[model samples]
Target chain A: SMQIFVKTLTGKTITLEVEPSDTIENVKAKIQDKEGIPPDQQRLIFAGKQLEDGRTLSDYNIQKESTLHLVLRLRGG
Target chain B: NLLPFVGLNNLGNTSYLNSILQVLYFCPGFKSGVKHLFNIISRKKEASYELICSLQSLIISVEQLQASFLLNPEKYTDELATQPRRLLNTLRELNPMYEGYLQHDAQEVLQCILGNIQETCQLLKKEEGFELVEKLFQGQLVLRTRCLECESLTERREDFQDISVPVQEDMKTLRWAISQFASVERIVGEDKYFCENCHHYTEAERSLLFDKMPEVITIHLKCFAASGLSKINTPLLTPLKLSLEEWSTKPTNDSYGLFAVVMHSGITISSGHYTASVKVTVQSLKEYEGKWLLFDDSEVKVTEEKDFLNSLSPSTSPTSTPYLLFYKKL
Candidate 1:
C-alpha cells in the first residue's frame, strides 16, 4: 500500500493507501474521508501544484516512495 | 451519437441532466470534462471492480453532503444549492453507485439518476425556503403548465380558434410580469441573424410554436375554485400552444379557451376558459397586443374570475393598482 500523505485544510496530515492508477479525484476523496473535510470544502495539491481530474499519480510525477502533499489552496464561503 | 440522440426522447425530462453536466464541467470537478466514454473502455475489468469499491466510499461522502443541505439548509442557503454545477459535482461523487457498478448502460443509468434528482427537486420546491431555488432549477414551470393544458384542450372537443386569444394574453401577462421582476433593459420581439462568414443578414423569421383552432371556450371554474382566483398560473414562458373549436348548433354559437397560468412565486393560477363564442386561433403576443390598440375598446376582460377549488373561498379582490396591463385587441 502506497502511503498518500494528505494535509487537511485545517493543517492536519492524514495517510491513506492508493494504487498507482488511481486518479487525483480518488486521492481527494481519500483525503476527505479521513480529515472530516466535507467534499465541497476539500481542495488538493501534489508535487509543485494542484492536481485536476483525469490525471493519474504518474502524471503528477509521483513515485511509490513519493509523498503526495495536499493543502487548503483557497477559501470558500 | 445514436445513444445520446435516443436519450433525447426524454430531453424535456433530461434537461436538468444536461444542466447538471454543464454545471459540473464549469466547476472543474472530477469526471467534469472526461467524456462518459472514458469512464468506459479505458478502465479495466479489475479497474471496474476498483471503481465500484471507490464509488461505495464516494456515495457515503455525497449522502453526508446532501444530508447537510437537508438538515440545515439555511447554512448552505440557495447560494450554491440549486446551482446546476454544484448539484452535479455532488452527483459525480456517487456516479458509480447510482445503479450499482456491475451494469454497463451508464447513459440510461445516468438518465435514471437525473430523474431521481428531479423527483428530489420536486419535493424540495414544495418546502418553504427552497421554493424559489427549486423554480430556477426547473428552469421554466410556466411553459410546462401551458403545454399540459394545451394537451387537455386538444383532447376535449373545444373550439380551437378561441384558444389562441388567452394564450397570447397569458404571454403578454408573463412578459409584463418578467419585466416587473427584472430590469426592462430592452424588449426586442424581432430576431435578426447575420453571418460574418457570408456577410448576410436574414430577415425576421416567424416561428409557429403551437397552433390549433377552438370555437367554443368555457371557463371551467371547478379546476381552480380553491385559489380564490382563475387561470392565474397557466402559460409557461416564451413559446406557447392553443387549440380552437366552434359550436355546431348555429345562431348564437360561441367560442372559448382552455389554458394554465403560473405566478412569479411559483404558485400556479390555472384553469380552462369558455369565452363568449368568438372565432379565435392562437396568435402571436405582438399581434394580439397590437390588434387591441387598433380598436377604440379600452378594456380587455375575462368572462369571470372565480375560485377554482372552494367555490365559497373568498374571492381575491382585484388589484387596486389601477392600470390594467392588457390592451383591447381589435
Candidate 2:
C-alpha cells in the first residue's frame, strides 16, 4: 500500500491509501465516492504532467506522501 | 488452428464476436473492472485455467493491436485481422458450440461469451471475478403487474445483463424506442394476468422498471424479426448522454455516457458485416473534446461522435444502424 496526498483546488487535502497496481482511474473512483466528483470530471496532475486513465500511479513514479494536484473539469469557457 | 479455417488468418464468421470485442476492448471501465479477475484466474491452475489463459491471450493480442494503433496508426490492418483468430480458436476449443457456423447474431454471441465467463468464474471459485462482470453489466429489473378490478399488485424482480428493446414500425429516436419499452401496457381481455385478490384472471396493467443500474450497461436493439435479422427502418436520434431516472424505481445515479456502438450492415443478420464505433482518449493529442474511432474489420478511421450519430439518423438505410450500445455511468 502507498499513501499519496491530493491537493484539491479549494485548499483541501485528501490522503489516499492505494494499492501498488491501482491506476489513476481507480483513484478517481475512490475520490468520486468520497467527494462526489465524477470520475470523468477529474483531472489529476503530478510532476507537471497530466495523468492518463490507463496508467498506474507507479508509472508516474508516485511515492509515499507524494503531493498531486487535483482539478475538476470546468463547464464551458 | 487445430480446428477449422483454411490457410488464411481471417477469422471469418466471427465478425459478430470481433465487433463486440473491439468496442469492449476500448471500454476503459470494462478493462479496469476485469483486470484483477483475469490476473487471478491466470495465476491459478484451476479447471478453468486453460480457458482463462486463452482469454488472457486474447486480451494481450487486443492490447497489442491497441498499442499498434497508438504506435503506427496507419499500418495496423494485418494485426487487426489476425489477433482475434486466437480468441476464436480458444472459444471453439472451450465449447464446441458455434462450430461449423458461418454466421451469428451479435446479441447471441455476446450472451454466450458473458454466460461462459460467468460460469467459468463461478467454477474457479473467483466470486470477485464474477462480481466484476455483474457490476459492469448486470442490472436489476422489476416487472409489476396490477389487477384493475381488485387493485392487487404483483412485483417480481429479475436480474439482467442486457436490456433488449423492441423497435416499433414508427419509432423515431432511440429515446422514443426506450420510452415505448418502459411504457405501461394493458393486459385485458383473455390475456389478463391471474390475480389472487380477484380470484380469477382479470383485466390488468403490466409495466417494467429498473431496480438497479450497473456501472456499464448494454442496450440491444431487437432488429431481428421473422427469422433473419430485419432492420428497424425508423431513424433514431442518438443521445450522447442518457438519463434513466424516470424509468427506475430505486434510482441513485441514472445518468450514462455513451462509449461504444455496434452497427450491422446487410439485409439479414446472418449475411451482414459488423462494425463498431468506440470512444477513445488520446492523451498524447490532448484530446479533451474526445475522439471516436470506427472499426470495420481491418479498416480503422477517425470519426466525430456527432457524425457517427448523424449517420444513424432517419433517411439513412437502417442497414447500418446501431445494434448494440455500450454505456457507462457518469
Candidate 3:
C-alpha cells in the first residue's frame, strides 16, 4: 500500500493509503468517505493532467507520499 | 417616444437570437464592426458568407427603419418589425442544434454567433472587422496553481469570450457571482498537479484571476443546475457601475457601466422566451443616445431607465429575469 496526501482548496490536507493500481474513482470514493464531499463533486488533478476516473494511479506514475490536488467541482450548467 | 426604433420579427424560437442581436446593435463598437463586414459582403456575393450576409441584411433593414422613423415617427407600430428568416435559416443550416422553434440558452446562441462571425472575419482577413469581436469581448484569465510542498507556482493564461458565473440562492447580486468566480479551487489525491520543479505530483491550489480586461465584458448567469433539468430563480441584482479593480491581478483603473440585459422567462433552462433592455449610451449615435429600448421579439417598446433596471429581478419581475449581462468599459 502507498500512502498519499490529498490537498483541498480550503488549505486542508488528508492523508490516505491506496494501491498504485487503484482507479481515480476508487480514491475519490475513499476521499468522499473521509471528508463527506460527494464523489461526483471531487475533481482530482495529478502530474499536470486532470486524472480521469477510469484510469489508475499507476497509469499516472503516482508514487508514495505524492500529493494530489482535489478541486471541488462547481455545480452549474 | 420621441423617435421610433425597429425590432426583429421572431422566426419560430428566435427570441434568444433577437435579444442578443438587439444588444449588439446598440453596442457602438459592434455596429461599426458590422458595417465593415457589410462592405466585404457587398464586394463579393458569396454563398459561403451567407451566415454573416443574412445578419448584415437584418441590420440594414433596422437602420432603414430607423431612417424612416426619423422621417416620421408616427409610423411606429406600422413598420416596427422586420423578418429575420434569412439569418435564422442560415443559422439553422450551419448548426442543427437549433433546428426548430425549441427554446435555447440566449448566451449559448450569442457565443455561437460571435464565434462564427469571428471565424468568418478571420477567413476574410479584415483587420478592421470588430469581427473585432475578440477585441471587444475577449479577456485574459491568469490561472495560478501552487504546489504546497515546494511552494512553486505554475501559471497558465487563457482567453475567455465571456465569464459564466454560477448563481446561488445566497448570492445576492452579480458582484457576488463575479467575486466567487475568482476564488481558489483545490486539486489532490489521485489527482495531483505535476510540478516539474519537484519532479513529481504535488498538492496544489488553483485560483483564477483576471489579467486583462476587455472593452465590453459579458457575464452569463448560469441559472441552470448541474442536473440540467432544474434552474435557480435567484434575484441577482445588477449595478449601473461595476468596478473590478480589486479583482484584477495587476495595476488598473478600469470600471464598467451596465448597458444591456438579455433576460429569460421560463421555469426550465431549455425552454424560455428571451427579451432585452438596452441603454443607448453611445454619444456618437446622437439622436438615439440615452434612450432605453426593450426588444421582445416582434415588439420594440421605449422603456425608462428605472423600468429597465427595476425589471431585472429574476424571481419576481413580471417583465423578465436577466440571463446575460453586457457592460462596457467606462
Candidate 4:
C-alpha cells in the first residue's frame, strides 16, 4: 500500500493509504470518507499536475510519501 | 440604468429560472460537472444546444472569465440578454408533457435539465459525461412497505435527483426534518396496504431509506402538501454543518456543508415570488473565500448567514421562507 499525504488550503493535513492502481477519483473517495469533503469540491494537485478524475495515481507518477495539495472550489453565489 | 440590470431583473415570470440559476451558478459541483460535459459537447462536430452553451457561459463568468456582475451589472446582463429564453425553450423541448411557462416549481425545472442532459449523454455516447452527471446529484432510494399483520416487506429501489423531506408538526430544526424524512410511519385509513405475502388488505408501515448518496445533495422542503397549502415561514434551526449519517441505510459518509438556499415569498404557490441566497467567493476579496449573497430579481446585495437563518424563522407577519436547501458533501 502506498501512503499519500494530503495538505488542505486551511493548513490541515491527513494521510491516505491506497494502491498504485487506484484512480485519482478513488483517492478522492477515500478522502471524502475520512474528511467528509465531497469529491467534486476536493481539488487534488500532485507534483504540479491537477489530478484528473479518470486518471490513476500511477498516471501522475504518485509514489510513496508524495504530498498532495488540496484546494476547494469557490463556493456559493 | 435598469438595462444594466440584465440577469438580475425578472423578465415576466422568469423568477423560477432565475431562482434556480442562482443556486446552480453558485454550486461548484454542478458547474464543474456540467463544464466537463460542455467541453465534450463543444469538441464534437454536432452543434451544441443553447442551454449547454449558456450554462458554460455562466460558469465562465462565475470563474472571472468576464467582469464581476457585482461591479458592472449592466454589462453582465447585456451579454446574456436572450440566454434565459433560450434555456426555457430547451426545457420546453425536453419535457413536452409539462406546460412550460414563467411560473413553475424550481425543483421541476432542475429535474428537466437533468433528464435532458442524460438524454444528451446517451445520444452522444459519452459514458464519462453521463457518469459524472450521475455522481454529482443522483442518489438512490430503498423503499419497503411492510404488512403489519404478516410482517412481510415489499422492497423497491430507484434513483432520485433530490429528496423531498416533509416538515413534521412542531419541527424546529433541519435535523428533525430529516428524521421525519427517514422515519417509518404506520399507514392506515383508506391508504392501508395489501401485502403479497398476506394475500389480503392489511395495515402496513411504509419506510424510506437512502440507498446511496450523491456528491452534491439537493433537498426540497415539502412546504406544499395536498390536504393544505401552508408555508413554514418560521426559520428552521438548521445546523451550519449538517450530518446526515443516520438517515441512510448504506451510509459511507453523509456529512454536508450548507451553501445555497431558495426561499418562497407571497401567500400561495401560484401568486408567490421566489428568491435565492447563495454562498459565493468574491474575486476582489482575496482574504475571505466565502460569503452569502441575496438575489432578488435585478437587485443583488451581500448578506450574512445569520440573515438567512432568521428569514427562515416563523413570524406573525407573512414573509418569504426557505423552500429548498442545497448542500455539498463536506
What is model 1's interface RMSD?
26.8
Sorting all predicted structures by TM-score, with the top scorer first, yields 3, 2, 4, 1
Q: Summarize candidate 2's per-residue lDDT along B1-330 as a digit string, tens digits.
A: 010100113365666776777776666655654566677765663534454556566666656655656676666333344456666766677666556546666665666566666667677574444565677777777767667888877775556676555555423666766766666766555335556677675676666688877887787665543211244445466778988777888655568888888887775433667777877654544442466777766556667777777677766655575778888888
Model 3, B1-330: lDDT tens digits are 434667888877778788888888887687778778777777765535776787778888888887787776675745477887888888888778678777665665676687787778887885335347778887777767788889877676666666666566322777777765666656677566666788776777766778877799887676544322355666577788888766678868788888988877776654668888888762325665666777877777777777666666554545355778888998
DockQ of each: 0.01, 0.01, 0.06, 0.01
With a 3 Å backbone cut-off (N, CA, C), the pairs that clash in candidate 2 are none
Question: For every model in order, what is the iRMS?
Answer: 26.8, 22.4, 9.0, 18.2
Quality class of the docking in candidate 3, CAPRI style:
incorrect
Query: What is the C-alpha lDDT profile of model 4 across B214-280, one tens digit per residue?
Result: 8778776655422223344454566667766676786555578888888777655555677887876
Q: For model 2, what is the error of residue B104's alpha carbon versus the real structure, in angstroms, after optimal superposition?
A: 0.3
Each candidate structure's TM-score, on Cα atoms with residue i matched to residue i, is: 0.19, 0.71, 0.75, 0.69
Candidate 1 residues lying further than 4 Å off, grouped into runs, are A73-77, B1-330
lDDT per residue (tens digit) for residues B1-330 in model 1? 000000111111223243222222222112221232223323433352233233333333444544664455566522221222333334455454322212121122233343343343344334312121122111111110011111211111111111111221212432332322211111112212222233333221111121221121211111111112322333323212221112122232222222222111113221111111011121222232211111001112222222321111224322111111111111
**Poorest 10 consecutive residues by lDDT, candidate 3 chain B:** B222-231
Error of 4 at B312 (Å): 2.6
C-alpha lDDT of residue B224 in model 2: 41
Chain B TM-score against the true chain B, each candidate: 0.18, 0.86, 0.88, 0.83
Identify the candidate with maximal lDDT.
3
